[PDB]
Amino acid sequence: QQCVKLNDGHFMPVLGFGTYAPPEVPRSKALEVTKLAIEAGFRHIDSAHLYNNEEQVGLAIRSKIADGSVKREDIFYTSKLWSTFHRPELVRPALENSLKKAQLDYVDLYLIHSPMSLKPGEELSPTDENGKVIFDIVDLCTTWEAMEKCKDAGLAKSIGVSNFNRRQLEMILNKPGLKYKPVCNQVECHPYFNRSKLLDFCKSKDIVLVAYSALGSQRDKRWVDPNSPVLLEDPVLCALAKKHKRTPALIALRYQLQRGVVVLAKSYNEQRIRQNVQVFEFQLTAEDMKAIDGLDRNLHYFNSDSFASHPNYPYSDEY
Numbered sequence: 001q002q003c004v005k006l007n008d009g010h011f012m013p014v015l016g017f018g019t020y021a022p023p024e025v026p027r028s029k030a031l032e033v034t035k036l037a038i039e040a041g042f043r044h045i046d047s048a049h050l051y052n053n054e055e056q057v058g059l060a061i062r063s064k065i066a067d068g069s070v071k072r073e074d075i076f077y078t079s080k081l082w083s084t085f086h087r088p089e090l091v092r093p094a095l096e097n098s099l100k101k102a103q104l105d106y107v108d109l110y111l112i113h114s115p116m117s118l119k120p121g122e123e124l125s126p127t128d129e130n131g132k133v134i135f136d137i138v139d140l141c142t143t144w145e146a147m148e149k150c151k152d153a154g155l156a157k158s159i160g161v162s163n164f165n166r167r168q169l170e171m172i173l174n175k176p177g178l179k180y181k182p183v184c185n186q187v188e189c190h191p192y193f194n195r196s197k198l199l200d201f202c203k204s205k206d207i208v209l210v211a212y213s214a215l216g217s218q219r220d221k222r223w224v225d226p227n228s229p230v231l232l233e234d235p236v237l238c239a240l241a242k243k244h245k246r247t248p249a250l251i252a253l254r255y256q257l258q259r260g261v262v263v264l265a266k267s268y269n270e271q272r273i274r275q276n277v278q279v280f281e282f283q284l285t286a287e288d289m290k291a292i293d294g295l296d297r298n299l300h301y302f303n304s305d306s307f308a309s310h311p312n313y314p315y316s317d318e319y
């Protein structure tokens with residue numbers, strides 16, 4: 001397992017474990033799978049306030065340190081600030097609670113989960129009588145400045161963003177008095193949505209692209225595009241799998257690794273968890289890479305169309 005140096009000087013394992021699982025999955029599973037992930041070789045763990053699993057994931061991390069398997073410095077742990085906590089005065093308090101939940105002194109990375117602000121309050125998804133999500137209006141530069149203060153204090157080793165498009169990134173990059181550039185931009189990235197233009201832009205600013213839904217997505221009927229094709233069923237990925245004697249998932253992950261993208265992989269299956277670390281055991285040829293590049297269809301699995309009205313909807317621009 002290799003790492004990538006952040007514009008922070010910090011190192012980020014290029015292979016990360018995705019801890020999100022739908023609410024139907026017992027909260028107890030997050031604890032077991034994260035430990036299995038660690039034992040399998042994962043050193044980068046991705047969590048968030050939205051996942052409602054920080055206590056478990058954090059406990060899983062501390063259990064692996066306690067049993068002497070790893071050192072805190074060996075694990076790269078990240079959490080995120082939910083959209084209902086974008087308001088400046090709510091940022092540090094959010095990070096501290098996340099730290100308390102995980103029982104950690106610092107988070108390796110803290111991200112602004114999404115540029116789309118939501119009504120502050122208790123609800124993760126505040127909605128009106130019509131089931132419509134209530135938006136909020138916040139200057140993300142102030143959210144970022146609060147983010148910087150958390151790094152100043154040592155609560156976060158690095159800080160970055162997620163789901164930002166070029167315009168939104170430039171906004172932070174061009175902010176006067178900027179103290180810290182985001183070390184990354186975690187976005188949806190897979191062969192059907194390879195984000196080539198955004199990727200090249202991020203590299204030009206020394207911002208690493210971290211891919212999520214890299215194995216497709218979990219395809220939750222509540223949140224996925226019903227008409228979207230199944231990535232792991234792709235005939236090209238499957239042909240490549242056969243050629244390399246690997247799996248479509250391994251092919252999709254390796255693709256990201258070779259174009260300089262940090263890849264996340266969520267699995268709550270012990271055998272698939274262990275299979276996923278095999279992404280380091282082989283490599284795709286330039287022609288393999290070329291064929292995969294051609295699969296891009298600007299497809300995002302998240303069925304967000306109903307939020308395109310949000311002024312900060314990231315998918316309104318080319319990239």
Ligand SMILES: NC(=O)c1ccc[n+]([C@@H]2O[C@H](COP(=O)([O-])OP(=O)(O)OC[C@H]3O[C@@H](n4cnc5c(N)ncnc54)[C@H](OP(=O)(O)O)[C@@H]3O)[C@@H](O)[C@H]2O)c1
Binds near residue numbers: 018020046215
């Ligand atoms: N910031 C954001 O907006 C955002 C959005 C979405 C996700 N994320 C993060 O990124 C992670 C990954 O994204 P995602 O949740 O869409 O998941 P994903 O990694 O695209 O999910 C892959 C799905 O494929 C299956 N899988 C895993 N390894 C496999 C293998 N070797 N062969 C065949 N199937 C395999 C898994 O099912 P099994 O569990 O059955 O193995 C899993 O549900 C999340 O856990 C989360 O931490 C961030």
Ligand SMILES: CCNC(=O)CCC/C=C\C[C@@H]1[C@@H](/C=C/[C@@H](O)CCc2ccccc2)[C@H](O)C[C@@H]1O
Binds near residue numbers: 117118133302
């Ligand atoms: C467009 C790019 N994606 C983004 O920014 C991130 C969108 C939020 C993260 C994940 C998408 C959904 C989650 C849905 C959450 C909704 O309740 C709130 C969505 C929302 C609407 C308006 C403003 C902020 C958030 C669900 O838990 C599982 C599924 O994965």
